[model samples]
Target: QQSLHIPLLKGECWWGAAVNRAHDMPLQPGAFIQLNGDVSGNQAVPLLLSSAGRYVWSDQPFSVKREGDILSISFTGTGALYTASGGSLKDAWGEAAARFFPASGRLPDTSLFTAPQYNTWIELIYNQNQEDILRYARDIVANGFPPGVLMIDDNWFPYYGNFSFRKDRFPDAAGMISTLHGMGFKVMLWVCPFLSPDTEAFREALAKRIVLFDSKGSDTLQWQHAVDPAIVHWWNGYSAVLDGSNPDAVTWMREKLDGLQQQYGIDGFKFAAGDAEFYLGNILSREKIGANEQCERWGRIGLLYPMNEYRAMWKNGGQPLVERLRDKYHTWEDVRKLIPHASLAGLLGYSFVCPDMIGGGDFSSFKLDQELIVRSAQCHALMPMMQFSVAPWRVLDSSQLQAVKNAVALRRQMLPEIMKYTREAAVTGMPVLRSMEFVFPHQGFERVEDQFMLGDNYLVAPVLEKGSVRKIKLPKGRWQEIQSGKVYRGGETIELKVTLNTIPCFKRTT
Candidate 1:
């Protein structure tokens, strides 16, 4: 008989290739537990074992007083690392712990966390005040607005060379947060990892040798040299990069975050530019390794290996909390074997690993990139952890709006499932969103990128090209249309009609 210990809190967890028994073995900070139910087929429930307490698979946890016959554990789904078939599947019964703070409130609909769903992107460029932001928040809530999170985009901080909040514009940061909170909305702050040279922090960093410098011991210049004042450029002006690889730098950053959290009551931060520059620019030449090796080493070498850099690193709560790499080019068969790795990495790295929304940060007109937006949204909806971010709403047409709305609505209906998966991810290191190759890793469907599976039940097919009907090949199962309520058998490629509004979505009937 297979046996596993429940570190107080219990839930389903996914097992991937990269695991550390030293820390993750006995349930340390980032460790999680996954439980499979005998009666629930292969479905497994994951739970997180934190320094605080155990978190159930829901947004709300049961009180320790509520412990009784109500607690049960189960596991289901085949992934890259541990497949359900030929593997042990069973559920364990345990006493319920009283749900605690942070996890107490009802989680917003999973769809709310999705882009283009209930998400509204505020262009930070506009001049606004605490009152303005509060007004928006109050109006949204009073109107029963369902968009995910309200983002205070780019301009919250001083422009190009400045990262500090414009006190004049946002004098009452806490009041704004409180107001937003009172409005029943979560707040996201606009942030790019870059530091402008004129800022106090930048000056201090330069004095402390914390900023990136050239061989000549001078501050490295940016693309500004490529532009002429006589001509308009995409970037406002010159910018400098921080040596995040330095320990002191990370400490400084963490301190900055602490101050922001303590003072501003900021909910979350959006990290931009770091991903593009970290892999490109002078930093690339500094490392004498290949892209993957460089990327992996970056996790260890950098001040904050991940630091919310897009498409780079994600952190769980423990030492060596990084997930398995998913950058290798492999056949569909390889993708199948590696599917578990991606899923497990995502699970293990919950709330930390947020891949680029819809697409990496290339925001063109909504008309030109609508397909990418929908695809990104579908993929994002399936993840256990996500932020509320949908941008460039002005570009979307009415029909495209309807399609996104339909997808978002379906995501809302699966909030319970998403919450459960999120709980599992936090506890067990299993990713809530996954590719089809994880479920069906045969050699035939390697090129299929138009669709993938979310968790184990939902199948999402996004239109990659405009005005095109993409053929989606489904795995073996009964599939139900999330929008049209049409059902079809799996193991077949279905031609889906694409419009700006529609994201081809379906769920499992099995």
Candidate 2:
């Protein structure tokens, strides 16, 4: 075991793996973070970037805390913390990224970045039927929205990991994909690492040593609950998680997923729900590994499909995966988190990221907040990517729907610029949605999380809350607001009178 302590500057602010707390960063003393696993959709890493241009990194997961101005971090067996001065926040990340986790020089599909993606969470929910799926697609077109990645979420398959369409639910899976393709939409299905129990496929996989046992390194061959193998509780209930570390276990599922592509002309998949916390019990694997590594292995599966999205990852910086913010609720607080959290994601190297389904992925149907819907849609519009679940056409009025449409139109307008930075991320490991401190270092922009940099070209200030008087802090240089072509002087904050549809974005001219 090893530990290291770092002293912070008088006003030093730090960013790290606990992406959920990104909006509340430059953490005060007494704040502690255990980054051994993911928290909900929050992915973690053994790395920390600070406003002081210093970086704290380790090859293995570590625990970190701040007491007053002192930072304390600890690592287990053979793990070590390495700190270095890289001149500034952005400079430090450049060094850390190159030495720690460099880019893979690849990207997901180009369409994912160029257009707004849509998911069936709102319409299909847990029972995604062929009829409703078509209804959703037809509604997207009928509503005048562009057809992008149409994610046919869960319940499309009979079981958790069967990887095939359910005849009862999706009788015409093949036709659905082709029809979606004909409608200018690419299709992706939702999947996870856990396989259902008692099924013939599950029994066969267990016998073939395709699932992890209940104990680590056991001589019992639990091939004989204690020959039953391990079961973990997920959203859908308890099921056997595939031993990601076991190559054979991971290998066996590829054909089914690939077959979906080969047979149905499916574009890719939305790989969902693999986290370090899930590996807490039955830490057993055919191969000796830790829980975080298991999550890492799970993420690696995304490399097989270009049009892929993941909400959880472990040390997967620079990898070509569309990392979305964890599912959010239909609240102002969650909408407010979009920028800082996404900015932190760029800092952590998840470049090609999309926001959670607009108007929230929570599927909270109790009440509809009209302002929240328009603002949320506007918030997602200019991101590296955007997705819709709550069909604006179904819930919103004509005026509200127009606001959502405006957001989508803005994204299409800036598609070229978004894709430019997106391609750069493929080789440089830079995030397309960058943090303010990341692009503008040592300018006292450390704790500004409300706004973000879209590849340092566009300084985006989206209205995160309910009100309309927006104060945007601009980094040094001449900035021009795109909508009215109004220019503003930098090195200061400016106020904008905005409506629910006004997403204040400024393109850097100089």
Candidate 3:
């Protein structure tokens, strides 16, 4: 029998397949399988696949055959695979992660990794001009937000693939960057792998055969919604996806980034939009690498710049890359998903994870009221990192602004502890933002999504609901509520009467 059909152990829940849609139920194709036994403890093992591809809990890359109490597994790809069967799910997952780390290499230690960063995407959208960027920087400091890494998002460049700043918008790019540095902020620019068809860079890339081609032997084009009609119709305009499988294309991108850094003191880049769906039908390098592999290759490019952020990634886990959640909406439901999404990211070996920008990244239609905006800030206050695109000072009222400021201040105060575990994550492939199960294991911590532990010591249950009172669940341990200094015994749930100013954080003293 090449199948495994075992009954669910008492009080057991399955975890580890997909990070985004994690649930506490038995599912198929979960790579890291943890069988949690309430009283007897936990057992975890890894189902290592031979090929690198996306696998789910329901349908894995290989088959699982079950016959009564016996279970059997099979492999379809070729490689020396190993599995860890043990009493400790944490150890099993950690060992599996350690085994996978050699393939991705070690993470870079960039100063920006531990800093509170800012982005101009939500606030300025694509209208990122020199004057507004400078003004925003000044306001950031004036409003009591700490100065750190600042990202100059999309439309800063002349064209999609061309790496130069738009002269009309930024005539003195170098001077602007210099001034930003003077204000104590490291600068990062936004970039994508697509090349606008009408630009010189696109034509040059076409001539060099570095742009990806469709099956018809013509350049592949994407319909970008945010571009002008005169340009190609795509996100920024009609553009050709660069062939990342081509070594020359990758080299060209590195050269352009190098020039930017060398010429303007550019610190890093926000590498965006290399999702597998975007490359699904495209042909690259004679179809040597498919869409999924191409997505991984595109992400690998960010490994060159330590101060980089990526929204789309594939099988590049255990690599010290800064991965962020995709853009979310400005609603309570989306706000609530941050912790779960971030938790899932960590389980998938993306240790250096960032939640979507506070108050959501997309401000296209929805208007953020004061309460929503302040709660959004509080949600991101103590994650591994906190990012801002919509300026709090601009959208928040006086009281709301103070709450936002306090959240940032709290994040800054926790830096030393954050960085300590961050460095540990770099070596162990663990996450700084851990799910409760990752910390407690078999202690009935599964399905605890709204609340999370900062490390192993601090429990943060940000108020995600609309009401002022928040409910928090603590695992078995002594904890001290940070705001009131009220000591609460663990293994119980507590209701916190919070205000707009309260983030509802508790530190584990024992």
lDDT of each candidate versus the true structure: 0.42, 0.83, 0.70
Q: Between candidates 1 and 2, which one is better according to TM-score?
A: 2
Estimated TM-score for each candidate: 0.56, 0.96, 0.84
The clash numbers for all candidates, in the given order, read 48, 3, 17
Candidate 2 per-residue C-alpha lDDT over 83-158 given as tens digits, one digit per residue, 9 for 90 to 100:
4556677876787899888999999988787778999987668878988889889999998999888898877888
Q: What residue runs in model 1 are displaced by over 4 Å at the alpha carbon?
A: 1-122, 125-144, 159-163, 217-237, 276-402, 463-470, 480-487, 495-506
The sequence of per-residue lDDT tens digits that candidate 3 reaches over residues 1-510 is 123344333444444433444433233333333211110011011232111111222111233433332233443332233334543445545665655542254665355656678998898988999999999999999987778899999889877888999999998999999999999999989999888787788778877767776543336533211122112234554678777787888889999999999999999898887765566542435346655566678888988898888887665778867888777788887787788778767766778888878888875743467788788888887888888888888877899889888888888788888888888888777778887877887666766888888888988998888786787888888999877899999898888888888888888888
Compare candidates 1 and 3 on TM-score and give the better one.
3
As for lDDT, the candidate ahead, 2 or 3, is 2
Model 1: lDDT equals 0.42
Tens-digit per-residue lDDT, 1-510, candidate 1: 222224232432223213121112222234333222110111111333221122333221111111231222332322111122222211100111122112222222233344222222322234546766665555544533363456565566666436457898878778778876665666655454456666676667666655544432224543222211111112445655555545565566667665676787765544433322233333312223322222233343322322222234322222222222222221222222222333433333322233333333322222245555455454454444333233324434665545555555656677787666555544443445654544555424433444555667887665545466778887887889877999998787778776665656787896
lDDT for position 27 in model 1? 28
Candidate 2 ranges with C-alpha deviation above 4 Å: 78-86, 216-226, 364-366
Q: Give the Å shift of residue 334 in candidate 2.
A: 0.4
